[PDB]
């Protein structure tokens, strides 16, 4: 049960402290478990300038600085696991040794990953017909790349298998005269034939590389990643 | 997800992240999506532009939520955020919270309960710089695709479609003609053509082509007409002898009952388009953009992929 | 006149075009552009776009506002003047109503000329500001969109 941080700021005059007090009450009302917090840019506390400017709005941060830190200092039951990326947008009135410390960084693995094997292991639940695992050729990707696009590539491989079986059924439709008086009623034919072949997966065509070699640009590899990687040490600690 | 999905209903893995379209400015988008509306589901909620940025606090965060709900809750439904000038051009550059929290709204609406993945997604922005936002993540929008100013060659297809596509179960033409010659220079060499000549290759040139059918000859020389009371050589008296006003003193004999005649034909009043009218049209070229922009926009295009 | 006084605009088209001296084939192309769709309709009784709108951007001291009423007088156009900022109002959520009103009155007066004098009063840069999207943007963008998106089918207005 999590703060859904962007929502539930009431506009109404002097009301919205009610929603913070309610959300932390409803959190604590379950004894044992965390609240997820998005980016803290969901709150974006930003020291009074170039934005909300602390005037017409203060009502969330002016409560969150206090009461959940009181709970955090008694240190029981309920815990924070926020996912900040852009501390430049934040005031650092939290995110500090005095309140909510442990600015925790991991970075992105450069190229040596078991996560490639876990990529294969989660393309699993769907069949790869090959005896060889053939995973390692994915490391032909230029290094610093190991983002969630691993599963965008599994999606592209699955869509390639779908395209193969789609053109196969299109061929079967084209020759459907072999068992029906016309190449007709496709929307009935597939159901009344239904000779298994129920989209059984065709990862054998290895088309994850055939996607990857396009340099699928939803990956991020720019100097912005280097910016995060350096500032995590230089300021994120 | 709708032609082959009904025969591959098992649908193994991740849902489609919809459209991350971009292109050259002023072109290349709504003309596609409004036709894709033939199979999307219900007639999709093409809300677009500034309409999100209602007022200082909360209103956009209400409206976007009810937008996604009332879109999906009937049927699969696209939206039309188009340019990220509508939402999420950058972090910061905001006042009272109008934009940036509604950006984080977008990132939280895009999960979990779309009803049907035939929501898809649709962004269509020109000039795909000025985004700098996490929604470029693969699970938030699909792969980038460009719409661009081509070589001239497809203009022949464009022209013939514009001439012949719009029909009223009639086989009508917007600008009927019989081809006096092949397109020649029009298909492949028609101008400097750095910016596209757009509909402006046909608009006004249409009226120019009409002038060679409506203004030249008769209408510039006489009032053409047929039937009814008509002119007659009345020859009743000299026009000006007793006074300067004898002419047309007498009135006409009867009012007309009715008359019937077709409004247009290949014989009359049609556009009678010609290659030399298109030569005049391309002499009057107005390219939508110039290389002084494209030198910048080309960078904005190519840097959008492989680069960030 | 009684119609224009009760329902139409005050200060009807009322000037001799004879008095707008010195303008040349520029006034030729202007006047022909507003004459021909008005009095030669066989060339213009058609579904395509037909030069529905114009703007003027000369320095001050050459008379635009006069020639507008004069060309309106030259073909007895119906006439409505937006006298600048009177689209604005106190009520956010209703101030746009005067925009729908403009096309209401235009559609009620089919052969009409609509004149936004000092259009800057409701036309900043369309790329206005990185500050809040205040009413000054929301009125003008909606107006521009609607004057692009309506009466473009119901031809006749200018
Ligand atoms: N034929 C003409 N040619 C040029 N100027 C003329 C002509 N007849 C009158 N004028 C002058 O044009 C002036 C109008 O100038 P201008 O169009 O800049 O002002 P305006 O109508 O107040 O402006 P705005 O369009 O900003 O409301 C009049 O004061 C008049 O002296
Ligand atoms: N073949 C074509 N090439 C370019 N533009 C076209 C074509 N057919 C129609 N249009 C124009 O496309 C415009 C709408 O498309 P859109 O790309 O949304 O323009 P904008 O980018 O200015 O919003 C319409 O004004 C229509 O006249
Ligand atoms: Mg004026």
From Swiss-Prot, chain B:
Effect annotated for changing residue 29 to A: In Amut mutant; abolished ATPase activity of the PEX1-PEX6 AAA ATPase complex
* Protein name as catalogued: Peroxisomal ATPase PEX1
Q: What is the effect of changing residue 83 to A?
A: In Bmut mutant; decreased ATPase activity of the PEX1-PEX6 AAA ATPase complex
The record's note on quaternary structure and interaction partners says: Interacts with PEX6; forming the PEX1-PEX6 AAA ATPase complex, which is composed of a heterohexamer formed by a trimer of PEX1-PEX6 dimers. The PEX1-PEX6 heterooligomers associate with the peroxisomal importomer via interaction of PEX6 with the peroxisomal membrane anchor PEX15.
**Free-text note on domains in this protein's UniProt record:** AAA-cassette D1 is required for interaction with PEX6. ATP-binding in AAA-cassette D2 is required for interaction with PEX6. ATP-binding and hydrolysis in AAA-cassette D2 is required for proper function in PEX5 dislocation.
Q: Which residues form a coiled coil?
A: none
Q: Where in the cell is it found?
A: Cytoplasm, Cytosol; Peroxisome membrane
Portion held of the full protein: 716 to 1023 of 1043
Source domain of life is Eukaryota
User: Altering residue 82 to Q: what's the impact?
Assistant: In PEX1pB2; results in accumulation of PEX5 on peroxisomal membranes
| Residue sites binding ATP per the record | 23-30
Q: Induction: what does the entry report?
A: By oleate.
Swiss-Prot record, chain C:
UniProt subcellular location = Cytoplasm, Cytosol; Peroxisome membrane
Q: What is the effect of changing residue 64 to A?
A: In PEX6pA2; increased amount of peroxisome-bound PEX6. Results in accumulation of PEX5 on peroxisomal membranes. In Amut mutant; abolished ATPase activity of the PEX1-PEX6 AAA ATPase complex
Q: Binding of ATP: at which residues?
A: 58-65
Consequence of changing residue 91 to A: Cells are unable to grow on a medium with oleate as a sole carbon source
Highest taxon of source = Eukaryota
What more the UniProt record tells us is: Present with 1630 molecules/cell in log phase SD medium.
The entry sums up its family as follows: Belongs to the AAA ATPase family.
Q: What is known of its domains?
A: AAA-cassette D1 is required for interaction with PEX1. ATP-binding in AAA-cassette D1 is required for attachment to PEX15. ATP-binding and hydrolysis in AAA-cassette D2 is required for release from PEX15 and proper function in PEX5 dislocation.
On subunit structure and binding partners, the annotation says:
Interacts with PEX1; forming the PEX1-PEX6 AAA ATPase complex, which is composed of a heterohexamer formed by a trimer of PEX1-PEX6 dimers. Interacts with PEX15; anchors PEX1-PEX6 heterooligomers to the peroxisomal membrane and mediates their association with the peroxisomal importomer. Interacts with UBP15.
Function in brief = Component of the PEX1-PEX6 AAA ATPase complex, a protein dislocase complex that mediates the ATP-dependent extraction of the PEX5 receptor from peroxisomal membranes, an essential step for PEX5 recycling. Specifically recognizes PEX5 monoubiquitinated at 'Cys-6', and pulls it out of the peroxisome lumen through the PEX2-PEX10-PEX12 retrotranslocation channel. Extraction by the PEX1-PEX6 AAA ATPase complex is accompanied by unfolding of the TPR repeats and release of bound cargo from PEX5.
This protein is called what?
Answer: Peroxisomal ATPase PEX6
Q: Which organism is it from?
A: Saccharomyces cerevisiae (strain ATCC 204508 / S288c) (Baker's yeast)
Entire protein: which part is shown?
715 to 872 of 1030
């Amino acid at each position: 049960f999590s703060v859904k941080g962007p929502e539930l700021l009431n506009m109404y005059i002097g009301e919205s402290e009610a929603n913070v007090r309610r959300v932390f009450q409803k959190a604590r009302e379950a004894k044992p478990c965390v609240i997820f917090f998005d980016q803290i840019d969901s709150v974006a506390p930003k020291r009074g300038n170039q934005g909300d400017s602390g005037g017409v709005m203060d009502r969330i941060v002016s409560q969150l600085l206090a009461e959940l830190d009181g709970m955090s200092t008694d240190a029981d039951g309920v815990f924070v696991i926020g996912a900040t990326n852009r501390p430049d947008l934040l005031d650092e009135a939290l995110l500090r040794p005095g309140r909510f410390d442990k600015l925790l960084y991991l970075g992105i693995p450069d190229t040596d990953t078991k996560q490639l094997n876990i990529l294969e292991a989660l393309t699993r639940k769907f069949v790869l017909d090959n005896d060889v695992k053939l995973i390692e050729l994915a490391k032909l990707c230029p290094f610093n790349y190991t983002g969630a696009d691993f599963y965008a590539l599994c999606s592209d491989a699955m869509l390639n298998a779908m395209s193969r079986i789609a053109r196969m059924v299109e061929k079967k439709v084209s020759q459907h005269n072999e068992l029906t008086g016309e190449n007709i009623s496709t929307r009935r034919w597939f159901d009344k034939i239904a000779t298994k072949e129920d989209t059984k997966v065709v990862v054998k065509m290895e088309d994850f590389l055939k996607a990857q070699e396009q340099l699928t640009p939803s990956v991020s590899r720019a100097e912005l990643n280097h910016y995060e990687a350096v500032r995590a040490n230089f300021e994120g600690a | 997800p709708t032609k082959y999905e009904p025969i591959f209903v098992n649908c193994p893995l991740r849902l489609r992240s919809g459209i991350l379209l971009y292109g050259y400015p002023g072109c290349g988008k709504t003309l596609l999506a409004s036709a894709v509306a033939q199979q999307c589901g219900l007639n999709f909620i093409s809300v677009k532009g500034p309409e999100i940025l209602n007022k200082f606090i909360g209103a956009s965060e209400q409206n976007i939520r009810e937008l996604f709900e009332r879109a999906q809750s009937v049927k699969p439904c696209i939206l039309f955020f188009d340019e990220f000038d509508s939402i999420a051009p950058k972090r910061g550059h905001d006042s009272t919270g109008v934009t940036d929290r509604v950006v984080n709204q977008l990132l939280t609406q895009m999960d979990g309960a779309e009803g049907l993945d035939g929501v898809y997604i649709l962004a269509a922005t020109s000039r795909p710089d000025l985004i700098d936002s996490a929604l470029l993540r693969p699970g938030r929008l699909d792969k980038s695709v460009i719409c661009n100013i081509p070589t001239e060659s497809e203009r022949l297809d464009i022209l013939q479609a514009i001439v012949n596509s719009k029909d009223k179960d009639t086989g009508q033409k917007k600008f009927a003609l019989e081809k006096n010659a092949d397109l020649k220079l029009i298909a492949e060499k028609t101008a400097g053509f750095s910016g596209a000549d757009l509909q402006g290759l046909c608009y006004n040139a249409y009226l120019k082509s009409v002038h060679r059918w409506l203004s030249a000859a008769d209408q510039s020389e006489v009032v053409p007409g047929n039937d009814n009371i008509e002119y007659f050589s009345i020859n009743e008296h000299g026009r000006r002898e007793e006074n300067r006003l004898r002419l047309k003193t007498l009135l006409q004999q009867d009012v007309v009952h009715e008359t019937k005649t077709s409004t247009s034909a290949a014989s009359e009043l049609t556009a009678v388009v010609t290659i030399n009218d298109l030569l005049e049209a391309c002499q009057e070229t107005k390219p939508s953009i110039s290389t002084s922009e494209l030198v910048k926009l080309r960078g904005i295009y190519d840097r959008f992929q492989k680069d960030r | 006149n009684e119609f224009s006084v009760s329902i139409g605009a005050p200060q009807i088209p009322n000037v001799t075009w004879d008095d707008i001296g010195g303008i040349d084939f520029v006034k030729g192309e202007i006047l022909d552009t507003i004459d021909m769709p008005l009095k030669h309709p066989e060339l213009f009784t058609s579904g395509m776009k037909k030069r529905s709108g114009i703007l003027f951007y000369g320095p001050p001291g050459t008379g635009k506002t006069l020639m507008a009423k004069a060309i309106a007088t030259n073909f007895s156009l119906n006439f409505f003047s937006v006298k600048g900022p009177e689209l604005l109002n106190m009520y956010i959520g209703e101030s746009e109503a005067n925009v729908r009103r403009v096309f209401q009155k235009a559609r009620e007066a089919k052969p009409c000329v609509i004149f936004f004098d000092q259009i800057d009063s409701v036309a900043p840069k369309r790329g206005n500001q990185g500050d809040s999207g205040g009413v000054m943007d929301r009125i003008v963008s909606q107006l521009l969109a609607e004057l692009d998106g309506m009466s473009t089918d119901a031809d006749g207005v200018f």
